[PDB]
Write a protein that binds this DNA or RNA. Structure first.
Ligand SMILES: [K+]
Ligand SMILES: [K+]
Ligand SMILES: [K+]
Ligand SMILES: [K+]
Ligand SMILES: [Mg+2]
Ligand SMILES: [Mg+2]
Ligand SMILES: [Mg+2]
Ligand SMILES: [Mg+2]
Ligand SMILES: [Mg+2]
Ligand SMILES: [Mg+2]
Ligand SMILES: [Mg+2]
Ligand SMILES: [Mg+2]
Ligand SMILES: [Mg+2]
Ligand SMILES: [Mg+2]
Ligand SMILES: [Mg+2]
Ligand SMILES: [Mg+2]
Ligand SMILES: [Mg+2]
Ligand SMILES: [Mg+2]
Ligand SMILES: [Mg+2]
Ligand SMILES: [Mg+2]
Ligand SMILES: [Mg+2]
Ligand SMILES: [Mg+2]
Ligand SMILES: [Mg+2]
Ligand SMILES: [Mg+2]
Ligand code: NA
Ligand code: NA
Ligand code: NA
Ligand code: NA
Ligand code: NA
Ligand code: NA
Ligand code: NA
Lengths: 68, 123, 81, 95, 50
RNA sequence: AGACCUGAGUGUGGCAGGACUACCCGCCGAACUUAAGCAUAUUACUCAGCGGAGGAAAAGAAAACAACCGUGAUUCUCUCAGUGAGCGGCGAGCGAAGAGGGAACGAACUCGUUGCCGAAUCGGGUCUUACAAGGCCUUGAGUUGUGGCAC
RNA sequence: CAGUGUCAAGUUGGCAGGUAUUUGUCUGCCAAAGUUAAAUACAGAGUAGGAAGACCGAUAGCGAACAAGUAGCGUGAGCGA
RNA sequence: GAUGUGGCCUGGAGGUUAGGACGAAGCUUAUGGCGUGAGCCUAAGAUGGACCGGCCUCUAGUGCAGAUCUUGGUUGGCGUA
RNA sequence: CACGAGUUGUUCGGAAACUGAGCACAACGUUAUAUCGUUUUGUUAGGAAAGUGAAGGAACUGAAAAGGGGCAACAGAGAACCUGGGAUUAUAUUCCAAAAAGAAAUUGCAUGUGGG
RNA sequence: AACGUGUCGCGAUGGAUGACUUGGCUUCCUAUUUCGUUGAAGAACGCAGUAAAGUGCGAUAAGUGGUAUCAAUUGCAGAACAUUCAAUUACCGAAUCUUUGAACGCAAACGGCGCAUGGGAGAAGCUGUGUCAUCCCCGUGCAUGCCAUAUUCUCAGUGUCGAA
């Protein structure tokens, strides 16, 4: 990410931005997406999108509406 | 005692001379501070210390500005000691600059020129 | 006899002062700190003791550099003209 | 150089030698052994203390004995050469 | 005993220097709340163990 | 002689380790507990453990839904729905999705391939008031293919 | 989804269409490179500012209204007024 | 054990009415009066020093004699062992 | 308890500077995870880990030499000083001043005398 | 009568209650809002005329510079540009910033020991002056890995070729 050729290339210089540091550690590459189940969409992937934890969070948290 | 204005108008050799005199004076006052001494004599230790601080402040500000203007030339910029470069932040120093951020492919530029964003209204 | 007499039998010390954290948790024989894991590069940190983490985290010292850079960020790295 | 600060060689001896001592033992050493007693920089050398004595008081240190006090300061017992009088030097120092 | 590393000696020196009572003029001050050092240490009461 | 191509040494320019860790992402991963016992189940894809980033992250431009008079990237909210879905010693328990009203929304782009070109590319020196998206030079890298154009 | 074995097809084609199979129709879409703002989180974080409360009122409210993660304790992890 | 009570009581809120340096809250009582009672109210302080009562409605961390109850203080044993 | 003092080294002890039982940086391997393992039976690592005696025309070049860098003993190894003092309130083989009370030993550099 | 009981007035011990709250807890919002090899967080040691803790700071040390503000700080002392040079305050661009710590020349219950390179001081001899061996002091660089690179550096291989 420090090479000038990389930094001045609009096709690859997205990876210079620090949100992509160690993206493989976070399962963000193609192989990580594969084992996360993110090759599938719709009814074959509803319980794992945008992640398993995200779906668990929105399926298991108790909602208290103000007027209920 | 030393007004900062006089020190700005003072040369480097003269600054070093007056630093030596103020250091010597503070040393003598330390001797007095050991053997009792009068309140008036003990009470000039702090002005002498603050004057020494002023002389060192002028000396270091002048040295750093002169060095910065020395390494600012095209030839010697890339060898600038890291203590003279802008600090900012580690991530900001590593981050893409606006020119690098704004790079576009030639097709992207042609597309941006072919269909600019317009201003319009409806009645 | 265990108890008072054996209290008399205790000589030496398992721990001395740690160079890194200063806690008297440095195991002399093992040459590692029981409090901060020195000389391992990273410190000890365990979620089963949030209290110890809150004792040791950022802000329990003086934050001598953090305050300055926080001010510079807050002022948008202002420089003379 | 990555160190830019203006350091001058004409004030280092003021860091090496901090101030003299005036206790009864120090006074007895002035009178009886031609010896001055100073608080010095705790990281300073015996050799540097001799050089700083020369530079600050124009006097020759024939022997420097040092110790670190239980309060954390380094004290120097400095015997001058017989060509110099400790009492006269102490007076000029203001001791 | 005789042996100690200089660093331990300096820590003990700082503890000696801290084992002092409060100056009285501190008690004469305008918003003062301190009257005793409250961190005084006796060598027989509590150990530093350096 | 020499070459490239595989691998070393040193000089030069730079980067990683640490901290934080509420939220977020990847792994790993219990038991108490509930079932009036208990082993499947439950607690729970939770706690504890190991990694990683940000101001949010992750997701995201259909190998999507539907079965309609059709919708149209992602995320989120109400609702669908504690469900005449389903899972379950079909016990205890568990348990979503599409459609609908909405928040947001200038939301869309890149490569690879194909086919037409084929160094037009990159880095480095050095000029232009300029480590220019510029000129000149440059075997240094690159033809074991960078870069342009097109549906 | 993972390990291992085994491993395609080529739009006369694949994938999906929530009861396995073999047929033959229909519908939607085109996996196995990649980037992307907002609307969402902040369930024991931080920086700089702000606004509040039918809350607590010194054995309460944070452990801490105070030189409090202090004094003190523990070999230590920790404990903690 | 159930239920009722223009039944008693406490901290706050919306209302409405008052009181207080000519003395609020708190505290003391051979200090009387009222109520079956929970309690209310007056008097006197040779008490105190600045807030607070009544009534309707709203609200809650709302009533203690005991839990080998929690914290603080005291206490007989005892001028004893 | 308060105030004010006090610990003096070429040779003493340590370290500079040894090896031991052992430890484990690097290297490599393993592990979803290095915060794991190997690491003295002469000895790391599929492993190219030596950087300078010389010369030769003042610092530049380079033979041969197998098995990286450390740590671990204040009772092992090692280590050139020792008496006198009328010398303290408190230190002393540490202080003493030219008659050093004095007497030595031992390093590192330099200067002369002399050499066979 | 003596202990001992009761009741009342007045005292002591003891710190409840009430009023007071620069604190806590909870909710909401705004942003050119997110540290570190340019050495962080954290540890340690120091710094005031008087100074234990705490706060603030770092050998320029209860602070230097700057811009505002305008007459203090205050326990004592000390100081005495006012049209702003204040021990005033507030804010912030310039500076400083000890020993450490990822800690990175090698080590470490050692304020220890190096290599390279710049400096400083320097006795005795030399013409008070310069010069200076050993010794001593200071600056800078020097971990490992990885990437790029060498106006095209130095090499290795019974790897593949090939000279004329
Ligand atoms: K103890
Ligand atoms: K049960
Ligand atoms: K909709
Ligand atoms: K109260
Ligand atoms: Mg000594
Ligand atoms: Mg000890
Ligand atoms: Mg269980
Ligand atoms: Mg439970
Ligand atoms: Mg059971
Ligand atoms: Mg966990
Ligand atoms: Mg995102
Ligand atoms: Mg992405
Ligand atoms: Mg209290
Ligand atoms: Mg409390
Ligand atoms: Mg009953
Ligand atoms: Mg309440
Ligand atoms: Mg209650
Ligand atoms: Mg009862
Ligand atoms: Mg005492
Ligand atoms: Mg061994
Ligand atoms: Mg050793
Ligand atoms: Mg010795
Ligand atoms: Mg202090
Ligand atoms: Mg290290
Ligand atoms: Na960690
Ligand atoms: Na002893
Ligand atoms: Na890190
Ligand atoms: Na971050
Ligand atoms: Na599989
Ligand atoms: Na009670
Ligand atoms: Na003392």
């Amino acid at each position: 990410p420090m090479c000038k050729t990389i930094r001045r290339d609009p096709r690859i210089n997205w990876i210079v931005n620090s949100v992509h540091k160690h993206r493989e550690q976070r399962g963000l590459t193609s192989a990580g997406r594969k084992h996360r189940g993110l090759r599938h969409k719709g009814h074959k992937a509803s319980k794992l999108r945008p992640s398993y934890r995200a779906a668990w969070r929105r399926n298991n948290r108790i909602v208290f509406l103000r007027k209920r | 005692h030393m007004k900062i204005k006089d020190l700005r108008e003072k040369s480097k050799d003269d600054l070093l001379k007056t630093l030596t005199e103020y250091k010597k004076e503070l040393s003598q006052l330390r001797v007095v501070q050991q053997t009792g001494g009068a309140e008036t004599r003990l009470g000039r230790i702090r002005p002498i210390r603050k004057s020494i601080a002023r002389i060192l402040t002028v000396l270091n500000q002048n040295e750093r500005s002169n060095l910065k203007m020395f390494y600012a030339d095209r030839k010697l910029r890339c060898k600038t000691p890291k203590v003279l470069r802008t600090k900012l932040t580690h991530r900001r120093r590593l981050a893409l600059k606006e020119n690098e951020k704004n790079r576009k492919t030639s097709r992207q530029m042609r597309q941006a020129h072919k269909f600019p964003k317009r201003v319009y209204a409806v009645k | 006899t265990k108890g008072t007499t054996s209290m008399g039998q205790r000589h030496g010390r398992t721990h001395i002062l740690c160079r890194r954290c200063g806690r008297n948790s440095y195991h002399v024989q093992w040459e590692r700190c029981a409090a901060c894991a020195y000389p391992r590069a990273s410190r000890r940190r365990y979620n089963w003791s949030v209290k110890a983490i809150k004792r040791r985290r950022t802000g329990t010292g003086r934050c001598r550099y953090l305050k300055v850079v926080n001010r510079r960020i807050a002022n948008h790295f202002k420089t003379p003209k | 150089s990555n160190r830019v600060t203006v350091e001058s060689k004409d004030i280092a001896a003021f860091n090496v030698i901090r101030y003299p001592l005036t206790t009864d033992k120090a006074m007895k050493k002035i009178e009886e052994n031609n010896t001055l007693t100073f608080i010095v920089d705790s990281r300073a050398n015996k050799t540097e203390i001799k050089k700083a004595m020369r530079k600050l008081y124009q006097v020759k240190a024939v022997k420097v004995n040092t110790l670190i006090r239980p309060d954390g300061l380094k004290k120097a017992y400095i015997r001058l050469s017989a060509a110099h009088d400790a009492l006269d030097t102490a007076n000029k120092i203001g001791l | 005993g005789r042996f100690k590393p200089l660093a331990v000696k300096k820590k003990y020196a700082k503890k000696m220097n801290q084992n002092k009572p409060v100056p009285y003029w501190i008690r004469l001050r305008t918003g003062n709340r301190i009257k005793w050092n409250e961190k005084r240490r006796h060598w027989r009461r509590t150990k530093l163990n350096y």
